[PDB]
Design a protein around this ligand. Structure first.
Ligand SMILES: CC(C)(COP(=O)(O)OP(=O)(O)OC[C@H]1O[C@@H](n2cnc3c(N)ncnc32)[C@H](O)[C@@H]1OP(=O)(O)O)[C@@H](O)C(=O)NCCC(=O)NCCS
Ligand SMILES: CC(C)(COP(=O)(O)OP(=O)(O)OC[C@H]1O[C@@H](n2cnc3c(N)ncnc32)[C@H](O)[C@@H]1OP(=O)(O)O)[C@@H](O)C(=O)NCCC(=O)NCCS
Ligand SMILES: CC(C)(COP(=O)(O)OP(=O)(O)OC[C@H]1O[C@@H](n2cnc3c(N)ncnc32)[C@H](O)[C@@H]1OP(=O)(O)O)[C@@H](O)C(=O)NCCC(=O)NCCS
Ligand SMILES: CC(C)(COP(=O)(O)OP(=O)(O)OC[C@H]1O[C@@H](n2cnc3c(N)ncnc32)[C@H](O)[C@@H]1OP(=O)(O)O)[C@@H](O)C(=O)NCCC(=O)NCCS
Lengths: 265, 263, 265, 263
C-alpha cells in the first residue's frame, strides 16, 4: 500500500489546480507570467519579478536561430516527410545536448567550477589552454569585440540593471577581456551569458541555498531553458514547411562521399 | 545556378541581428512583445494584438502542468527514474500527446468549426457524431467533470469573454457541452476543446487574418502546438523533481498486470 | 484490486522466460530464429518455417538504403551533433510513416481493399487514375520493367517458390503488367511486394482467421516490419559517423531560400 | 569543386543493386548471411564467422522481450493506450534505455575490460568500485537473482563456451559475479553484462579485428545497439497487443502517488 511515486510540483486532485502551493487563480492574480510559472514548476519557489522577467527574456532570445542548425534542419526534414507536429519537433529536439544547444549548461558548469576553485580569470584561461580545452560560452562564428551580438547585449543590459549581484557574470566578463586579446571573436556568446546569468540568479536572488542552486545546475535546468525556448522555433519551422507545401527531401548524392570497404577485404 | 533545396520564412539569422518574421530582435524587446508576441511572429507570421499575445501566454500558463499521473508526465517520470537525460525524458512524455491525451485541439477546432459552418444545431452535431461512432474531440475528461470543474477552462472563458470581439464558435461549443454534460457528467468541454475553439474565434476575428488564412492555420496543426509547448514546462519540471528526489529505477508491479498468454 | 494492465506476449515472472507460451529453451530447441520469435511476440502464433524465413528476408532487404533518405540523414545529423545512439536512432525513426517508409502499409491496405471489393486489376488502375490517386507500392525512382530491382526479384522468387497461395501478390503483378504499359518505371517496388506478400502470409499461412489478418494490417504490423528492419541501418549510420569522426553539421545558407514577411506587413 | 559535406561507408544504393559494406545484396542472400551477417556488415564492416553471426542472432532473440512491467515496455504501452502510432510508441519506450535499464552493455564492456587489462583481481575491482561510489555496470537485477536465475544468461553462456575460441573477459566477469552474489543475491551478471563481456571476447578473438579495432567498436557504443535492436521487437509486440486488446487511455492512480508540495 505505500505510494510508489513521489511528486512536488503540481496538485490537480482538488477542485482547483495548484502549482507548487499556489492555486491557479492566485498565479494569475499575482501576474506571475510564464517566468513565474516556471519558477513554481521547476524550482518550487516564488521568484522575484525581475528573475521571472529574466527567464522570459531567455526563452525569447533562444526561440529560434534559423533553419540551418541541426535540430531545426531535422524538424524540417521530418515535416517534409509528412509527419505530425510532435514527431517532427522531437526529431529536432533529440539533436540537443552536446555540440548543439549544450553550451548553456556546459558554460554554467565550467565557469562555476573555475570561480568556486578560487582561480583568477587569467589563470583559468591559461589552464584551459594548457589542457587543450575550449572555454564553453566563449567564441562566435560571426560576431566579435567591435561587432557585438545583440542578444548578448539585450540580456546583459537587463541583468546588470536588475540583478543586485552578478559575481559569475563579472568573472566571465573578465575572462572575455582576456580571450578577446588572443582573437577578437572570442567574445562571451549568448550561451555563455545565459549560463552564467542563470547561476547568478539561482545563487543570489534569495530563493535558493547554494546547495539547491548547485543541484539545479547539475540536474540540467539550463538544458531545460534552451530546450523549452528553442521548441517554439522548431514548432514554427514545422508549421512553415507545411505552409510552404514542401515535399519529401532526399539529400543529393553529389554532397556525399561513399567510401565503402573493398569487396575482397 | 543550382536552385535552393530548402525554403524558410520565419527567422533570418544571417545578418547583423536576428529577425523573427517581420521584426528584428531589438524591436521585439523595444515593443515588449513577450513570449506570446514571439509566438505570433514565429508561428503565425504576424504582430498580433496585445490581447491575443496575452491569451497565448495564458494558454501556455494554464496548460503548463496537470500532475504526474497523466500519460506524458508519467512517461517522463519513468525516463527520469531510469537515469536518462532531460531531452530523452521530455521527449518520451511528449510522444504520448495525441488523440486521447493533449492533442485534441486541432480536431476540436476542425469538427466544431465544420458543424458550426454547416448550420446544424448542437444536438444534431452530437447525434451525428454518435451515429458515426466518432468521439467529440475536445469533450470529456477522466477526472474533471460538472462535479469537479476545471478552473483552467473558467480562467480561459473569462478572459476570452472580456477581451475578444466575438466568440461564436465558443458559444456553439458551450451549447454542445450543455447537451453532453446533461447525458454524462464527465463530458465537459475540456482544455483541448476550449483552447481549440477559442483559437478559431481569435484567428477568424482578431483582424490579422483572412478566413482562408485562419482555416489554413487550423488545417496545418498550429493549435496542438500550444499544448505541446505549454505542457513541456511541466514535463521538464517533473524530470527535475524526480532527479532532485533521487528516485530510482521503476518497474511496474506484477499484481497490476493480467498475463493471459496462449496455452 | 483488479489489474489495470493486460498483456499477452511474454511472461518473465517464472524461473524461465516464456514468449507467447513457449519457454525460451524451446524457442532455441525448435530453431525458431528471429522470424519465429517475431511470430510469437507480434502475433502469438507458431508460424510455418517458410513464413519465418520470409519475415527474416524482409528485415534483411529493408535494413538500409543509404544515407540520403530522410531518416538516415536525420540519424546522421544527430550522430554528428554528438548525441547518443538511442537519441540518434529515434531522431531518424521519427521521420517514418507517411512519405518515407509508409508505402509498405499503404500498399497492403490499398491492394487489399481493391482485391476484397471484387474490382479487377484493369478497373482498379482506371479508378485510381480518375480519382487522382497514386497506386501505393508501384513506381520507382531509378528501376523499370527491363532494369529490375534485385530486392524485389529475390523476395518475389522466395514467395512464389514457398507460399502455397499468393492471391494478393498475383493481383498486384497483374496491376504491374498494366501500369508498366503507361510508363516503364511503374513497376512493383519493394514496399509493394513486401506489403502484398505479408497480407498473403497472414491470410493463407493457416495460423490466422481473416479477421485476425485484417486486424494486424489495420493496427500497423507492416509499419513495424519496416521500422524494425531499417533500425539496423540507422544504427549502422550512427556508428559509421562516429567511426569517421564526423563533426557538427550546419546546412549551407546557399541551399536555403529565406523569404520572410515584409517589416511593414 | 565543392567538397562533399557527408561521408559514409556502410551502404551504397546508387548502383544496379544495393551493397552492404563489401557485399552486393544478391551475394548476401547467396551466402546465407542472415540477419546476423547483415548486422556484421552494416555495423562492423566485416563478413564475420558463422558462429559470430549466429551469436548475434541469439542475442537479438534473447533480448526480444522481458514483459510489460519494465520501463520501456511500460512507456510503449502507455503511448499505445493513448492512441499513438507505432513509431511514436516504440520511440517513447526506447528512450528509457540507458544506464539503469537496458543500456549498460557499453559500460559493462568498458569497466570489465579496464579492470581485466589492468591486472587487478576481481575482488579489487569490486572493492574499488564500492570505494568510488560507482555501480558495476552489467551487475544487478530488480527481479532475477541466484534464487530466480536468468535463462537468457544461461543460453548465452552455453553458446559462448561451446563456440568461442577464448573467453577471458567472460571468465573474469563470472569471478566478479561469484563475489557480488555472495554479498547480495540479486547482484547477478545480468543480460547487459553478459552480452557486453561476451562481445568483447568475440571482437578481440574472432579474427576479423585488431585489438585497436575491437577497442574502437566498444568506445563508439556498438554493443548497446544490440539491446536496442533486439528489444525493439518486443516493444512493437506490446504496441500491437495493446491495440488488439482495445486498451483505453491510462491515467495512473492517485493512491500510488505521494503529493508533497510546498506550504
Ligand atoms: C564557437 C566556436 C566553435 C568558434 O571557434 P572558431 O572561431 O571556429 O575557432 P577554431 O576552432 O578555428 O580555433 C581558432 C583559435 O581560437 C581558439 N579558440 C576558439 N574558441 C575558443 C574558446 N571557446 N576557448 C578558447 N580558445 C578558443 C582555438 O583554440 C584556436 O587557437 P589556436 O590558433 O592557438 O589553435 C568555439 O569558440 C567553441 O567551440 N566555443 C565553445 C562552445 C560554445 O560556447 N558554443 C556556443 C556558441 S555556438
Ligand atoms: C478523455 C477521454 C479518454 C475520457 O474518457 P472517459 O471519461 O474515461 O470515458 P470512457 O472512455 O470511460 O467513456 C464513457 C462513455 O462516454 C462516452 N464518451 C467519452 N468521451 C466522449 C466523447 N468525446 N464524445 C462522445 N462520447 C464520449 C464513451 O463513448 C462512453 O459511452 P458509452 O456508455 O456509450 O459506451 C475521452 O472523453 C476522449 O477520448 N475524449 C476526446 C479526446 C479529448 O478531447 N482529449 C482531451 C482530454 S484528455
Ligand atoms: C515512386 C514514385 C514517387 C515515382 O514517381 P515518378 O516516376 O517521379 O512520377 P511522377 O510524379 O513524375 O509522374 C509521372 C507519371 O506517372 C504517374 N505515376 C507515377 N507513379 C504512379 C503510381 N504509383 N501510380 C499511378 N501512376 C503513377 C503519374 O500520375 C504521372 O502520370 P501523368 O504523366 O499522366 O500525370 C511514385 O510512383 C509513387 O509515389 N509511388 C507510390 C509510393 C510508393 O510506393 N513508394 C515506394 C517506393 S519509393
Ligand atoms: C538494475 C538495478 C537498478 C537493480 O537494483 P536493485 O536490485 O533494485 O537494487 P537497489 O537499487 O535496491 O540496491 C540494493 C543494494 O545493492 C547495491 N547495488 C545494486 N546494483 C549494484 C551494482 N551494479 N553494483 C554494485 N552494487 C550494486 C546498491 O548500492 C544497494 O546497496 P547498499 O545496501 O550498500 O545501499 C541495479 O543493479 C543497477 O543499476 N545495475 C547497474 C545497471 C545495469 O547493469 N542495468 C541492467 C539491468 S536492468
Amino acid at each position: 500500500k505505500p505510494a510508489s511515486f513521489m511528486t512536488s510540483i503540481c496538485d490537480e486532485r482538488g477542485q482547483e489546480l495548484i502549482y507548487a502551493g499556489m492555486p491557479i487563480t492566485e498565479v494569475f492574480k499575482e501576474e506571475m507570467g510564464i517566468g513565474g510559472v516556471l519558477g513554481l514548476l521547476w524550482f518550487q519557489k516564488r521568484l522575484p519579478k525581475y528573475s521571472c522577467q529574466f527567464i522570459e527574456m531567455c526563452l525569447m532570445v533562444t526561440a529560434d536561430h534559423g533553419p540551418a542548425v541541426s535540430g531545426a534542419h531535422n524538424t524540417i526534414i521530418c515535416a517534409r516527410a509528412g509527419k505530425d507536429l510532435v514527431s517532427s519537433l522531437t526529431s529536432g529536439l533529440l539533436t540537443i545536448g552536446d555540440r548543439f544547444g549544450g553550451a548553456l549548461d556546459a558554460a554554467a558548469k565550467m565557469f562555476s567550477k573555475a570561480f568556486d576553485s578560487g582561480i583568477i580569470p587569467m589563470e583559468f584561461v591559461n589552464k584551459m589552454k594548457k589542457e587543450g580545452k575550449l572555454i564553453m560560452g566563449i567564441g562566435h562564428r560571426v560576431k566579435s569585440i567591435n561587432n557585438p551580438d545583440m542578444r548578448v547585449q539585450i540580456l546583459k543590459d537587463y541583468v546588470r540593471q536588475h540583478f543586485p549581484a552578478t559575481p559569475l557574470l563579472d568573472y566571465a566578463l573578465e575572462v572575455e577581456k582576456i580571450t578577446t586579446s588572443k582573437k577578437p571573436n572570442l567574445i562571451l556568446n549568448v550561451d555563455g551569458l545565459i549560463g552564467v546569468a542563470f547561476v547568478d540568479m539561482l545563487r543570489n536572488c534569495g530563493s535558493f541555498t547554494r546547495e539547491e542552486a548547485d543541484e539545479y545546475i547539475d540536474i540540467g535546468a539550463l538544458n531545460g531553458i534552451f530546450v523549452l525556448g528553442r521548441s517554439m522555433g522548431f514548432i514554427g519551422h514545422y508549421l512553415d514547411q507545411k505552409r510552404l507545401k514542401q515535399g519529401l527531401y532526399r539529400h543529393p548524392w553529389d554532397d556525399i562521399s561513399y567510401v565503402l570497404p573493398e569487396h575482397m577485404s
